[PDB]
Each structure stands twice: as C-alpha cells, then as structure tokens.
Design a protein around this ligand. Structure first.
Ligand SMILES: [Mg+2]
Ligand SMILES: [Mg+2]
Ligand SMILES: [Zn+2]
Ligand SMILES: [Zn+2]
Ligand SMILES: [Zn+2]
Ligand SMILES: [Zn+2]
Lengths: 449, 449
C-alpha cells in the first residue's frame, strides 16, 4: 500500500541565480499528498515542541545552518503543514490574552482547555483537567516526557502537574505561591511531587536541583524528593552512560534521568546581540559549547532511548520531546544559542521521523508553543533594540533583531505559527487550527476514551 | 457530486473558557483534505497578494476584527496551507539577501527567477524574463492586474515591466535612473510605458499621476501617457460608476482604471504607534476613513468587476489582485491603517473564493511577498520602538509593536510565511516551498508551454 512519504529533498534544486534554480519542488505534489492522508488509528504519537520556535526562528536557523536554499531534514520534512493560534485567557475577565506564556499554551495542547498565563493543568476556575499523558497511561499506553529544560519547567510540567502557578517547583515554593496545592494544606503537591505521583515510564531532562527538596507531609515527609523517587521505585540516571545501560523502563521500574541541576547545556555559544551590533561589531560565527560533554546526552540521544524503551509496550505510546532553550536564548537575545537549539531539535525530529517512517503507525507532530522576538532584518538596519550580524553557511551575513523590550528578556509574541505533521491523522493540522485542537486530534488519533 | 470544499467555519466552536470551547475543528479532516486534491488542469488563476501580510499581520487583524477565536471568511478559508521562502539575491555576489523588497519578490513569482532588491522583471545580469501575465497573454488567456497601490508600485508593475530599478515610473525617472531602459536611449521604456505596451485586458489601481508625463521618443512623443492610452484603444475609467458601466474588456478595448493620483484611500483611520504608546496613551478604536468613498471602488468591487469581464474569455484568465497598503501602513507604524487593509483584502478573497467555488476550475492562491515589522506583544510591554494599544472585537486590549527601525520607515523582515490555496494544483503550496516555485505551479496549472 502507499504507506506515507516524508518530503525527501526540498532544498533549492540548482543555481539560485538562474531560472528555476531556487525551486524546492521537482514536480507535481498532488499524488504524494494523496498518499500522505490516512485516518487509520495512530499507534504512537511523538510530539516535538520547539519552545518559542515560530516561523522566524525556523527561517533564521535554516539561513544560518543550512543556507537560505537549504532544507532541514527533520523540521522541514513533514508533509502536512498548517498554522495554529495559541492565545491565552485573562483569568479575571475570561477574555483572550493575546500573548501566552509557556504554561498556558502547554496546558492547552495537554488538556484541550484554555487557561491563564501561569496556570499548569487547571482552567481559569482553577479546576484541574486530565492531561494527554494521564489519559494515555489510564489506557495502558507507555508514556514519555523529554526536555532539555529543568523538568519543573512549564512545558514538561504541564503533562504531569495541576498547579495554579508555574512557580510551584517543589515544596517550599508551593507552600508559598500555590497554598491550595501544598501537600501540607491537603493539596496534590508541588510540580515535582505531582511529577513523581504521575509516574511516566520515561522522564528525561534537567532540574535535579528541586529534587534535593524535602517533603513537608505525606508518607514521604522529611525524605528528599530524590530519596522519595528511589523509594517509590524509579530508576534514577544522571549521565549518558547510565542512560544507555537502561534496558527496561515501565510502570514498576520507571526511568527518571536528571542530567543537570537546572537546564541542560546549550549547544552553541555566541555573544549577546547589542545596540547597533550589526553596524558596530563584526559578524559572528557560532562556537560549539566546549562544556556540553560526551557525559551529557543530546536531545536526539534522549529521544532515541525514549523511543526504544517506550516502543517495547505493545499497546502504543505517547512521547513529548521539548527543544527548550530556543525560547531561553531568544529571551536572552543570543542568536547563536537560539539557532544551535533549533539545529539540535532538528536532529531529534530526524530520529522521530526515522522510527515513524519505518513503523507506519506513528503520528509525529512538530510545532512550537508560541512565537517570540527575533526578526531577520536587512544587513544595514539602524534599529532601537538589540541586533547582531552573523556569517551564514552561504557566506553572506544575516542580521537578527530583538526589539520588543527595553527590559531584561525579549518577549514572546502572539503571531500564529507553523504546526506540521506526518502519519495517521496528520490532516488535522492543515489549514487554521487552535492549539486546543492539538489535544483532541491526539486523543482521537490514539483513540483514548 | 464532487465539489472541492472551502473551509466554511473555523471559528472557535464554543465557549473559550470551557473544555473544547476553543476548538476550531468539529471532526476529522482527512476526507475533506482528500476532496481538496485535484491534479486536473486549472482554467483560471486568481492570485491575491497581501503586500507585507506575514503571519503576524494576519493574527493581528483577526484578533482585532474577528476576535482571537474568530475566522476570516476569505483569508482563513483556504484548505491547503504551507510556508514559503522569499529571500532575494545580492547583485554583485549572487549570494542570498535574506530580506527582500517588494520588487525582487514580485519578480520571483512572476518570472520564476530570483533577483536583487529593486529589480522588476530582470535577473542579476539585467536580463529580461517573460512574466506569467505575458505568457498567459501569449497563450490566448485573458489577463488582469488589480491593485490599491499606484500601478507603478513594485507588485503590479512586476507583471508587465522589465526595468533595472523599481523607481523608473515614467519617462522622467527612467531617463535618470534606468538610462538603458529609457525610450529616448533605445530602451523598452519606463514602468508606465511598458504597462501600456503589455496591454493586459483589465488593469485597475491608482497611480494616475505619472500618466500626466509626456513620452520623450517614439510614436507618441510629446503626448501624455494618458493621451497615448486613449490613442491606443484603452477604455479609461476613474471612478466606481464608470468602472461599473464597462460591459467588456478585451484586447480591442482594454480597460485601464485609474482611481487615484497615488495610492487609493486607506479604509480605517487611526493614530501612528508611538514610543511607549501602550502605557502613555489610551487604547485606540479604529474608525472608517471618510475619504474612502462611494465613488472609489473597493478592492472587492474591482476584483468582482475584473472577474466578470475576464470570465467571458472562453480560454481562461490569470488575475493578480493586490491589497497594497497592508505594507505601507506597516511601514508607517499605523496599526489601524494596516488592519483595515488586511480586512479589505479578506473581502476580495471572499469574492474570489465564491467565484472559484461555483466555477470548479480556478486555482485561488492567497499569500504575501515577504514578512514585516509588527508584532503582537503583552499589554504591559516597555519596548524601544513604537507601540499602540487597541480595543479589539473581544472587548480586550491588544498591543502592537514596530521595533526594527530607528529611522523613518519600519522594515520588512525575512521570516518565511503562509501561502494558502484552493482548487486544482493547490497541493503544490503545501509544505515548504520557495516563492519561485509559485511561478512554476501557475505555469503548470494553466498548461503553459
Ligand atoms: Mg519550557
Ligand atoms: Mg506592493
Ligand atoms: Zn514557551
Ligand atoms: Zn519564554
Ligand atoms: Zn512588499
Ligand atoms: Zn514595503
């Protein structure tokens, strides 16, 4: 049967100065698209999130790492494409809040209800809603949660926690900031305690710092959340070699890999963008980070191990992978750290596509939770914010601009952005959709009742 | 009974604060996408261009006009969607110039070759390449070029003129800036003299000013280009009433509609964005422009009259419709001017879509030539550029920021952006493509060559 193609090569076909040379298409696409459509059940879902990776971040990373007529073998290879909205809600009024934070957007694809900036897993009325990871596990599917961020970070956290503030990392912060979720006040716990109660088969990421926190109540009071994880039966891993020796990850032997105290290291370094950086300073070439290490698994390696372990479950699996520091670096106005993290994510999408195209029954979805600050501007721009000129693979210079704040971070933006997919039920990402629809597409694809 | 479906409604289906309320989808889309794939020949093509309408401009205008959960009945109703690249080339090196202007992007889709910023209908060696309008004409199809800009602006002009600089409007500018194109020097002429020679069946827009110039050489030397148009068999109309009295437009009596000396009136009036505008000034409500007029045709009227006159051609037609000032008001940092022109264009897309849907053999493409400056940011943003707060349809405040230039005009940006299509060969806009691919898609759909 024509079992669904990936877009093989969408690079410019020839000499970009010549007629037809910059074309990405060889022929008519109708039949390839016809063969890409299937409403059969999805056995597995792999959802890759570039945090903050709107189309601007994708173009900039492409121009730099692959050239303007280049092609990302992972990211750009998904055949069904759309654009979706991710506006949040204003908690007091219930009216749209046009620019979402990373908690309210993540809660929307994980539970299918809109919420307010800061909420995790609860709606504006502070009522919880089951998440797609809780439902998959209730149906017996294996589940995985992978990020390069600390695991208490808004995006992995939204899959396993229901707190009224993304700040309730562990016991201290929760008692203070989320009293009604505080375990000593009869609540469900902090993000980390809920992480631990949620028991996904594979959880991989950073954030080991909050696991030193000690519980205020419950049958594990006075123990650290790390001790509690061990007692409860998790196999803890802290470096790449131990991750590679893990052969089983399942419900009474769940894997928890904590590879960094905070966020895992970024791939590329570069200077921060500066006022009139393109006019006043030289073009930049990004530097590989000397401290990332063979001891610290890359996102693609974490993805790969996750798929290996999770696919031993006969029933199927749900996996979420997060390319977390695209956002952070965009916030920091650091082009090289932002682009390196988009390159890094592209390798994980490659792994995912590899497995999915071999397996024939996996919906792979690649999107971002919201748009962000960076804009590609003409090389000579005199802009009011932070700018930087970079030397791209084409041997030309590209200038990036961060101009939506005078304060500490550069902000997110509310523009609609790409969602792309491959596999059974991928048709539901084409055209205009809302971020909450992603929930219902994945629930329906998997057939969760 | 096969009819290709348009998206009848992808507004949020319920209560935005409730489970599933924000969903834009009511069910599985696979079958409706299967019904959208047709490789049959296209008889007619309508290409709607929002100048500067990237994904940010669409979201901003939807939030304000339709509410965040709303839906543009035209712009958002097209079922096949992708993202394309529109980088230009550096004339000297032949390398990518990541942010294009309005002339090089327009040359890309109408000729199929990349060029340098400022070129119209020529490559980096200043060679002329036939445009899709010229090829359609040569093949016997009817042809139309509609714009709310001056008819000498980059977009319309790219379809009919081949000059080394977008600035060479009439004899005067062309003698000084394009001496090789200058008629008195042996060249093909200025943008207006070439437009007069290409003889499209319907051309409607502003730019009546340059038709007051007299030619420097040739058969109509000393006559104004307006007199020339009359001596050459053109039907000139300069208002809505007369436009609507035109019963036919063809090669014996081609229609040239000049509705304004410069650009046609913008739809909505508003103040410019201001430094710290969102904190220092109250929120703005846009208002109808009193100068828009009962005598000036609206974009949807010109589109509708162009389709009527052009559909009499048994062989088919190619029509380009440009919502020209989305860009110009984005340049001006004027949110209301910008959004009103996007709303205006949506109306033109609805007419195009109603025609195509009953006719069955028209490809309708809605996109933009390049991205732009505005960003939707949080209400409390302290930005370095220009910001303005706006009272939206949702009864909430949306803030827009223009932060990529310290000088007079806000700049275009290089992010890849939405292209959407409906009808035969619409499949070729899905996924990642390049702006020059749109030429080849149009060529192929119309069976040219
Ligand atoms: Mg995050
Ligand atoms: Mg234009
Ligand atoms: Zn985020
Ligand atoms: Zn962020
Ligand atoms: Zn333009
Ligand atoms: Zn412009």
């Amino acid at each position: 049967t024509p079992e669904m193609p990936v877009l093989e090569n969408r690079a410019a076909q020839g000499d970009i100065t010549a007629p037809g040379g910059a074309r990405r298409l060889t022929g008519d696409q109708t039949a390839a698209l016809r063969d890409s459509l299937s409403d059969k059940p999805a056995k597995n879902i792999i959802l890759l999130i570039g945090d903050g990776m709107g189309d601007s971040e994708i173009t900039a990373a492409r121009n730099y790492a692959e050239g303007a007529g280049g092609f990302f073998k992972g990211i750009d290879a998904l055949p069904l494409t759309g654009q979706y909205t991710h506006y949040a809600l204003n908690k007091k009024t219930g009216k749209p809040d046009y620019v979402t934070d990373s908690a309210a957007s993540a809660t929307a694809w994980s539970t299918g209800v809109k919420t307010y900036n800061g909420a995790l897993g609860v709606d504006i009325h502070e009522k919880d809603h089951p998440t797609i990871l809780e439902m998959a596990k209730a149906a017996g599917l294996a589940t995985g949660n992978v990020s390069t961020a600390e695991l208490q970070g808004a995006t992995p956290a939204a899959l396993v926690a229901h707190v009224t503030s993304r700040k309730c990392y562990g016991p201290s912060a929760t008692s203070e900031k989320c009293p009604g979720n505080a375990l000593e006040k009869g609540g469900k716990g902090s993000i980390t305690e809920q992480l631990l109660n949620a028991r996904a088969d594979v959880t991989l990421g950073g954030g080991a710092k909050t696991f030193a926190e000690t519980a205020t109540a419950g049958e594990w009071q006075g123990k650290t959340l790390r001790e509690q994880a061990e007692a409860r039966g998790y196999q803890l891993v802290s470096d790449a070699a131990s991750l590679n020796s893990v052969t089983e990850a399942n419900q009474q032997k769940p894997l928890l890999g904590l590879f960094a105290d905070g966020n895992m290291p970024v791939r590329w370094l570069g200077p921060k963008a500066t006022y009139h950086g393109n006019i006043d300073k030289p073009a930049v070439t990004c530097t590989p980070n000397p401290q990332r290490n063979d001891s610290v698994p890359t996102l693609a390696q974490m993805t790969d191990k996750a798929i290996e372990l999770l696919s031993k479950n006969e029933k199927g699996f749900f996996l979420q992978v997060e390319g977390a520091s695209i956002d952070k670096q965009d916030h920091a106005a650091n082009p090289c750290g932002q682009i390196g993290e988009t390159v890094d994510l592209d390798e994980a999408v490659q792994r995912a596509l590899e497995f999915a195209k071999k397996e024939g029954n996996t919906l792979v979805i690649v999107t971002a939770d919201h748009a962000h600050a960076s804009q590609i501007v003409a090389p000579d721009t005199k802009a009011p914010g932070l700018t930087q000129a970079l030397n791209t693979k084409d041997g030309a210079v590209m200038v990036m601009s961060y101009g939506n704040s005078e304060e500490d971070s550069q902000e997110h933006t509310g523009s609609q952005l790409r969602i792309a997919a491959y596999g059974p039920h991928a048709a539901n990402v084409v055209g205009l959709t809302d971020q909450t629809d992603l929930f219902y597409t994945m629930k329906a694809a998997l057939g969760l009742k």
